[PDB]
Design an enzyme around this catalytic site. Structure first.
Site, PDB file in Angstrom:
ATOM      1  N   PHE A  34     -45.760   9.078  -3.080  1.00 26.95           N
ATOM      2  CA  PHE A  34     -44.595   9.602  -3.766  1.00 26.95           C
ATOM      3  C   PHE A  34     -43.785   8.417  -3.930  1.00 26.95           C
ATOM      4  O   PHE A  34     -43.236   8.171  -4.996  1.00 26.95           O
ATOM      5  CB  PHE A  34     -43.818  10.752  -3.199  1.00 26.95           C
ATOM      6  N   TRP A  35     -43.233   7.945  -2.738  1.00 27.82           N
ATOM      7  CA  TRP A  35     -42.080   6.935  -2.628  1.00 27.82           C
ATOM      8  C   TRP A  35     -42.437   5.676  -3.481  1.00 27.82           C
ATOM      9  O   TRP A  35     -41.634   5.197  -3.947  1.00 27.82           O
ATOM     10  CB  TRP A  35     -41.449   6.610  -1.238  1.00 27.82           C
ATOM     11  N   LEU A  67     -32.295  18.926   2.550  1.00 32.36           N
ATOM     12  CA  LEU A  67     -33.564  18.954   1.952  1.00 32.36           C
ATOM     13  C   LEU A  67     -34.565  19.891   3.226  1.00 32.36           C
ATOM     14  O   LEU A  67     -34.451  19.341   4.285  1.00 32.36           O
ATOM     15  CB  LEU A  67     -34.216  17.604   1.745  1.00 32.36           C
ATOM     16  N   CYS A  68     -34.963  20.958   2.850  1.00 33.17           N
ATOM     17  CA  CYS A  68     -35.722  21.688   3.685  1.00 33.17           C
ATOM     18  C   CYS A  68     -36.955  22.476   3.127  1.00 33.17           C
ATOM     19  O   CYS A  68     -36.746  23.013   1.883  1.00 33.17           O
ATOM     20  CB  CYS A  68     -34.776  22.618   4.309  1.00 33.17           C
ATOM     21  N   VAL A  69     -37.896  22.322   3.731  1.00 30.96           N
ATOM     22  CA  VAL A  69     -39.259  22.945   3.202  1.00 30.96           C
ATOM     23  C   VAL A  69     -39.680  23.988   4.396  1.00 30.96           C
ATOM     24  O   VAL A  69     -39.783  23.479   5.622  1.00 30.96           O
ATOM     25  CB  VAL A  69     -40.190  22.059   2.798  1.00 30.96           C
ATOM     26  N   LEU A 123     -22.490  14.510   6.581  1.00 32.38           N
ATOM     27  CA  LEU A 123     -22.488  15.780   7.180  1.00 32.38           C
ATOM     28  C   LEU A 123     -24.033  16.436   7.673  1.00 32.38           C
ATOM     29  O   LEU A 123     -24.836  16.650   6.718  1.00 32.38           O
ATOM     30  CB  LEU A 123     -21.744  16.887   6.473  1.00 32.38           C
ATOM     31  N   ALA A 168     -41.906  18.843  -1.181  1.00 30.87           N
ATOM     32  CA  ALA A 168     -40.795  18.006  -1.115  1.00 30.87           C
ATOM     33  C   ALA A 168     -40.664  16.962  -2.155  1.00 30.87           C
ATOM     34  O   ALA A 168     -39.341  17.065  -2.547  1.00 30.87           O
ATOM     35  CB  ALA A 168     -40.792  17.228   0.263  1.00 30.87           C
ATOM     36  N   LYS A 204     -47.877  20.111   2.033  1.00 32.78           N
ATOM     37  CA  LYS A 204     -48.117  20.432   0.776  1.00 32.78           C
ATOM     38  C   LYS A 204     -47.902  19.893  -0.417  1.00 32.78           C
ATOM     39  O   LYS A 204     -48.013  20.204  -1.789  1.00 32.78           O
ATOM     40  CB  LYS A 204     -48.374  22.143   0.574  1.00 32.78           C
ATOM     41  N   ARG A 205     -47.045  18.791  -0.197  1.00 29.53           N
ATOM     42  CA  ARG A 205     -46.468  18.133  -1.451  1.00 29.53           C
ATOM     43  C   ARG A 205     -45.191  18.868  -2.060  1.00 29.53           C
ATOM     44  O   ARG A 205     -44.949  18.452  -3.482  1.00 29.53           O
ATOM     45  CB  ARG A 205     -47.261  17.447  -2.268  1.00 29.53           C
TER      46      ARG A 205
END
Ligand SMILES: CCCCCCCCCCCCCC(=O)SCCNC(=O)CCNC(=O)[C@H](O)C(C)(C)COP(=O)(O)OP(=O)(O)OC[C@H]1O[C@@H](n2cnc3c(N)ncnc32)[C@H](O)[C@@H]1OP(=O)(O)O
Ligand SMILES: COC(=O)c1ccc(N2CCCCCC2)c(NS(=O)(=O)c2ccc(CCCCC3CCN(C)CC3)cc2)c1
Length: 411
Positions: A4-5, A159-161, A411, A171, A168-169
């Site tokens: 991804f990145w 960000l939370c899964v 935060l 994010a 499982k891709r």
């Protein structure tokens, strides 16, 4: 490798980052009209959901997701447990964009599966001081100063899964959909922090902590120690004595911040934050939102001398679930937020932070070594933790800087 990145407009290696000499965008200039009108595709069993962060029930749903699935420390001793009230505060500042709060639910039964949030911030993110000196030597001052004006950008957090859907891709899909919603508002940069190393941070700092309630922390961290106190007895007596604090603040002039203080706090904060390479710019409405005390969330005190605010400090509350233990379910942590000292040494100001926090039932005070936080670590008995906070930009080339040149508290 980074499936991804590697496809995103970020510096790809430390080496790439070592070479950057000027602030500015990584990508092609684009226009809102280029950006897809429709949400990013996701599988048919899932749906996009925009929770209302001002609605108690939607806040509660996000709250539960994060409570059970958000950031854990490396040893899984702790997991953040941001409060509902904190979530509303953090996600709805003045001029917030409701479309930037993105969630995924299971279509069939509305089970909440993933979240990410953006909020607007106005940031100074021009070429840092040391790189400007270099640019001036080389006759490139104008190129170094091109992006000096504060920029209206996005700050990404939360960000939370869900644990059941990890690796499982999901994010990358959340990030692409967040990017699209932000771009559709004609914003092209974001700032974000993480405790993990990704491509590629512009600054990184350690976490430091200061015990306020030693009896509770030693129960949690292990059984019968820690190492350097091993020999006595009594090690517990020695430990209590080391971390003991006055029961009342020392600074005459200290009181809770009130709305009439907003203009003066803004002025002294903005003068101080100006000395840092990367740092926010707050309007009066933003000062009032982020700094005025809110029960259980944010705590702000000012030193007033002769009806003039001369110093102030703030901290905010993030409880953590104590994952392994039993006697204790929660750790009540205070995090150092913004401050400014013009009349007293910073250590004298932050001592009063510790006293008030202890008085209010906090177990520990935590901070990152940004701002001038290093200046009081030794004398106020902060110790380094195992955590690091890494700072990143999206679509912004930025020379590496020290964490003491960073003035954005995330935060
Ligand atoms: C202009 C506007 C731009 C706006 C967007 C700007 C970007 C904002 C970026 C987000 C800033 C968020 C700031 C915070 O909130 S940092 C806090 C992150 N949250 C947590 O740690 C909570 C607990 N963990 C989880 O919920 C997950 O494990 C997450 C969601 C983190 C990954 O889920 P999962 O484990 O199920 O993995 P996957 O298979 O779906 O995806 C794997 C891919 O994800 C990359 N990955 C792993 N961790 C992170 C991370 N913290 N930031 C960015 N990317 C991350 C990883 O390198 C890999 O990509 P690649 O290596 O294959 O290439
Ligand atoms: C989840 O972790 C906790 O809840 C936590 C709870 C307690 C901690 N200590 C360690 C020392 C004894 C107990 C009290 C203080 C730490 N320590 S530590 O060294 O301070 C760290 C702090 C924070 C992390 C998380 C990594 C940063 C996550 C980012 C935070 C900021 N966003 C905006 C994005 C995510 C890891 C270790 C952690």
């Amino acid at each position: 490798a980074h499936a991804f990145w590697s496809t995103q407009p970020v510096p790809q290696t430390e080496d790439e980052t070592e070479k950057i000499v000027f602030a500015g965008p990584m990508d092609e200039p684009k226009t809102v009209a280029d950006i897809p009108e429709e949400p990013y595709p996701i599988a048919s069993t899932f749906e996009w959901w925009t929770p209302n962060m001002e609605a108690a029930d939607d806040i509660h749903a996000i709250y539960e997701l994060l409570r059970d699935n958000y950031v854990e420390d490396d040893d899984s001793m702790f997991r953040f447990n941001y409060s509902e009230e904190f979530l509303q505060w953090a996600l709805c500042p003045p001029n917030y964009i409701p479309d930037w709060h993105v969630a995924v639910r299971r279509k069939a039964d509305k089970k909440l599966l993933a979240f990410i949030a953006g909020v607007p911030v106005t940031l100074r993110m021009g070429t840092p001081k040391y790189m400007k000196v270099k640019a001036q030597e080389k006759g490139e001052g104008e190129e170094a100063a091109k992006y000096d004006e504060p920029r209206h950008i996005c700050e990404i957090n939360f960000l939370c899964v869900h644990k059941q859907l990890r690796e499982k891709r999901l994010a990358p899909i959340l990030i692409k959909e967040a990017t699209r919603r932000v771009n559709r508002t004609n914003v092209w940069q974001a700032v974000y922090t993480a405790g993990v190393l990704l491509p590629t941070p512009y600054a990184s700092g350690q976490y430091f902590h200061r015990s306020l309630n030693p009896e509770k922390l030693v129960e949690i961290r292990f059984s019968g120690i820690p190492a350097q106190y091993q020999k006595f007895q009594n090690p517990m007596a020695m430990l209590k004595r080391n971390y003991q604090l006055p029961s009342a603040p020392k600074n005459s002039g200290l009181r809770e911040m009130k709305p009439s203080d907003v203009p003066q706090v803004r002025r002294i904060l903005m003068n101080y934050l100006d000395s840092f390479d990367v740092g926010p710019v707050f309007s009066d409405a933003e000062i009032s939102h982020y700094l005025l005390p809110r029960d259980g969330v944010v705590f702000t005190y000012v030193v007033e001398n002769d009806k003039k605010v001369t110093d102030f400090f703030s901290f905010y509350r993030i409880p953590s679930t104590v994952i392994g233990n039993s006697n204790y379910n929660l750790l009540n942590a205070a995090y150092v937020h913004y401050y400014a000292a013009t009349s007293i040494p910073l250590h004298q100001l932050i001592l009063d932070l510790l006293i008030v926090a202890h008085s209010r039932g906090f177990d520990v005070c935590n901070m990152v070594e940004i701002l001038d936080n290093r200046s009081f670590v030794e004398q106020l008995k902060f110790g380094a933790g195992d955590g690091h906070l890494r700072y990143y930009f999206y679509n912004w080339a930025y020379p590496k800087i020290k964490p003491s040149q960073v003035a954005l508290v995330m935060l």
